[PDB]
Amino acid sequence: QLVQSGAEVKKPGSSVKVSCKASYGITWVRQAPGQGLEWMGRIIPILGISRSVQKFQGRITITADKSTSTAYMDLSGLTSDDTAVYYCAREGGSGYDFFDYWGQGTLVTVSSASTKGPSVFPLAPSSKSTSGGTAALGCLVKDYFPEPVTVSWNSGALTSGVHTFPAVLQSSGLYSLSSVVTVPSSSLGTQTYICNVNHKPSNTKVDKRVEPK
Amino acid sequence: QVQLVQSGAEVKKPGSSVKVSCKASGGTFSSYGITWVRQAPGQGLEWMGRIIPILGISRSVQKFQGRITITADKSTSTAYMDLSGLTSDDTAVYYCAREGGSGYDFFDYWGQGTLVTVSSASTKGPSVFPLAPSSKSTSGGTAALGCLVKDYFPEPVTVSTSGVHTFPAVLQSSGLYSLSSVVTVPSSSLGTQTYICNVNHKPSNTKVDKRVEPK
Amino acid sequence: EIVLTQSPGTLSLSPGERATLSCRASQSVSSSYLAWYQQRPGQAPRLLIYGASSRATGIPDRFSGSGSGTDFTLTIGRLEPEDSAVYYCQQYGSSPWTFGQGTKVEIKRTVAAPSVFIFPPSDEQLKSGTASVVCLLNNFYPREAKVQWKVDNALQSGNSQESVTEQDSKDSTYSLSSTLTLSKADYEKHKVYACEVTHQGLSSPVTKSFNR
Fold first, then answer.
1. Of A74, B73, B138, C163, which one has the greatest count of Cβ atoms within 10 A?
2. B touches which chains (3+ CB pairs under 8 A)?
3. How far apart are CA B163 and CA C86, in angstroms?
């Protein structure tokens, strides 16, 4: 399994070391938001050899520490157009350079605007709803700037009806996304002390309890 | 710059014979002796003898004289001792080393070493033991997992290169001893690629490979 | 460098129907040097086919791979709802290795008369900022659903913002969250707030009610 790093927010004219915990290369693969994958470079820690695509040459250094076995890129001298999700993937050699196992991915967000904290918003379950099947309740996340914010319920337990909506731009550069869950546990409820949120840039975690109003 | 590659842990019986073979990787025994050097377990080096394949001459220390024959085959360029008539007190690691002549007999390049283990007890197989990684450990830095090697008698047993901690074997109630191998992986979840845990036993010649599973 | 065409793109097909994906190459490539990949909604792409013929170790052999020289075709013999994904043909044949434009498969099963709920503002961001109401439309197929906010029985402008999640891997249904952020003070005489839904699902516009 390939485990990567977390959403660097840098400024147009900076430097990002994306770390893929790593006879097998690591090839890196861009994907601009809502677009289609590219190639960026390849290394082999067994030999230290590195290769890069022509466009990204003079701005990228892909290295790896074979002993501690962890590979990194370092896209220095980057503009605002490189705001994209970057994957790390396993080579196979010469005639078999298809990308077998992939990394989770690390969204670099590069523009000098701000970093803002996930202000979590009221839940407030509707009273008279379904006759038991789906009592819908959701703790909303509005007013934050840099994505990601993962919001699991029951700190990763309730995984059966956690609907998450993609963040959409508001009037400011900040965007907001909404998390909802369905409970059959109508009155009282068993576990209602829930709604963990993790913000990778701000590092602020907020947990709140749902109450039927 | 000639690397010296030796042989592997002979287990013999008190009253036997061991031909330790030091190989001159290169094809080249030049004007260069092989001197042999004992080291009792947890002790300090001695001298045992010297040869020159270029001239066939051999010399031995007084104590080990009448029990040791140090020969070499210049053509195939491989040198051997043959400690015949040995007791239980010779259980030690034996090195082979390169001379320099008359006034320059300092031991330049050395061999890896070959532990002779001499007592009529047994040979027993490396029964590899459960790994079982701990669940709730570090927050990613070091997820420790190790495949243990218990219940074997004659050492060595190679096991498992960046966090392979190996512990020296310690005597159990029986003459058998056990040692433990552990590694740290940054991939805590699924803790997978370590399904080798290759072990090599020089006497038994039994190799066991197992896969680690996070429980 | 090889620019490459793909299939039509979004495809609507019932389960149990064969699906064909094309991959024409502008420049000639080797008869067997192209690999078809599949990336699920929100995840990392997983290898489906390598060499345009062989299958990835542990990939169900519905996903047949064929084609040679210029046109490469990926044919999915049977379709389940756990196939809804984006497929890219990468030609690791030339240099640099050019990924395909990518095709989106949409499994055409049900029309799911939707479930509409309101989550009207409560006294936690009615004690700072700008409040926002919201309209959840849970379990609905397909994406053809439009919601217009109704305020005190009076229709609203384009100050909404609707976000729709991708179809679930098993459910294959599309849920929505139309939002109406407002000026934090403006909650005086607007007694009721509602969202009006028009869908293939359910005869009428299903409007709603806040009061409280």
1. C163
2. A
3. 40
Q: How far is CA A9 from CA A30, A81, A148, in A?
A: 16, 13, 10
How far, in Å, are A71, A121, C128 from residue C131 at the CA level? Answer: 45, 9, 8
For domain B11-118, the question of CATH label 3.40.50.1700 is answered with no
The answer to whether domain B11-118 and domain B127-209 are alike in fold is yes
Handedness of CA A85, A91, A94, A96 (dihedral sign): negative
CATH fold of the domain at B127-209: Immunoglobulin-like (2.60.40)
- CA–CA dist C179, A174 (Å, integer): 15
Within 10 A of B128 (CB to CB), how many other CB atoms are there?
A: 21
Q: Which fold has domain A119-209?
A: Immunoglobulin-like (2.60.40)
The DSSP 8-state label assigned to residue B111 in this structure reads: B
Residues of B in contact with A1 (CB under 8 A): 187, 189-190, 192
Superfamily of the domain at A9-110: Immunoglobulins (2.60.40.10)
CA distance C65 to C49: 6
**Cα gap A48→C123, rounded to integer Å:** 59
Residue A3: list chain B partners with CB under 8 A: 140, 186-187, 189
Domains of chain C, each with CATH number or no CATH: 10-107 (2.60.40.10), 115-199 (2.60.40.10)
Beta-strand pair B92-98/C71-76: unpaired
Is B90 in contact with B116 (CB distance < 8 Å)? yes
Strands A205-209 and A193-199 come out as antiparallel
The tokens of B210 are what? Answer: 């197992």
Strand-pair partners of C78: none
Cβ-in-10-Å burial (0-12, 13-18, 19+) of A104 comes to: middle
State the CB neighbour count (10 A cutoff) for residue C34: 28
- Judge whether A68 and A127 are in contact, CB under 8 Å: no
Nearest CA in chain B to A19: B186
**Method used for this model?**
cryo-EM
Contact B125, B132 (CB under 8 A): no
CA distances from B8 to A188, B204, C185 (A): 72, 12, 86
Strands of A49-52's sheet in order across? A9-10, A106-110, A84-90, A26-29, A41-44, A49-52
What is the phi/psi pair of residue A91, to 5°?
-65, -175
Out of C97, C123, C177, whose CB is closest to A39? Answer: C97
Distance of alpha carbon B186 from the chain centroid: 31
What are the φ and ψ backbone dihedral angles of A81, each rounded to 5 degrees? -85, -5
